[PDB]
Every structure is written in C-alpha cells, then in structure tokens.
Amino acid sequence: AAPANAVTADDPTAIALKYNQDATKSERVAAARPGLPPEEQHCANCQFMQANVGEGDWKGCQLFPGKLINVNGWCASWTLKAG
Ligand code: SF4
C-alpha cells in the first residue's frame, strides 16, 4: 500500500513526466533516456532519489517535494545516480 503522500497517477507533474511507481508498467523503453539501457532504469538508481527521505521502498524524489516515490518506479526525468 502506498503512503499517504505517495506520488499518484493523478498528479499533474506525474502525468507530465510519465511517472509510475512500478517501472515495469512504465514507458522507459520508449523514452530511451541516456545513462543506462532503459530496462535497467528505476528510481533507486536515479540522481533525484533522496535516500534520507521516507522509509523502506518509499523514498523522496527531489522533483516531487512533499511526496514519496517508490524505489522500483520510474519517470521520464530519470537520470543516472552519479553522486
Ligand atoms: S526523477 Fe528519478 S527518482 Fe524521481 S520519480 Fe523520476 S526516476 Fe524516480
């Protein structure tokens, strides 16, 4: 079950970025964002994932202030976690 502050499918920014909390139900292949082959991309390996926000599988994303994403999710702003 998602936390009360999870990013939802109805969030305008989530719609614009094609977020899904389950990357296997995402359009990561179509987007072909650079840095890793698309099938390998999810929030856990994204630069915008905030490891010190949230709990368990529900973590922060810098792009979604006040909310939580799932580490197994994806959106079109996916960017390799480089530091
Ligand atoms: S920017 Fe990165 S951490 Fe945030 S929802 Fe998109 S893929 Fe997940």
Swiss-Prot record:
Thermal dependence reads:
Thermostable.
Say if the entry is tagged with keyword Metal-binding: yes
A Gene Ontology biological process in which this protein takes part is: aerobic electron transport chain
Per UniProt, the keywords (alphabetical) are: 4Fe-4S, Electron transport, Iron, Iron-sulfur, Metal-binding, Transport
Pfam families recorded: HIPIP
Any idea which GO molecular function terms this record carries? 4 iron, 4 sulfur cluster binding; electron transfer activity; metal ion binding
Asked if Chloroplast is a keyword of the record, the answer is no
**Subunit structure of this chain's protein:** Homodimer.
Which family is it part of? Belongs to the high-potential iron-sulfur protein (HiPIP) family.
| The protein's role, per its UniProt record | Specific class of high-redox-potential 4Fe-4S ferredoxins. Functions in anaerobic electron transport in most purple and in some other photosynthetic bacteria and in at least one genus (Paracoccus) of halophilic, denitrifying bacteria.
Its name, as the record gives it, is High-potential iron-sulfur protein
| Source organism per UniProt | Thermochromatium tepidum (Chromatium tepidum)
Gene field: hip
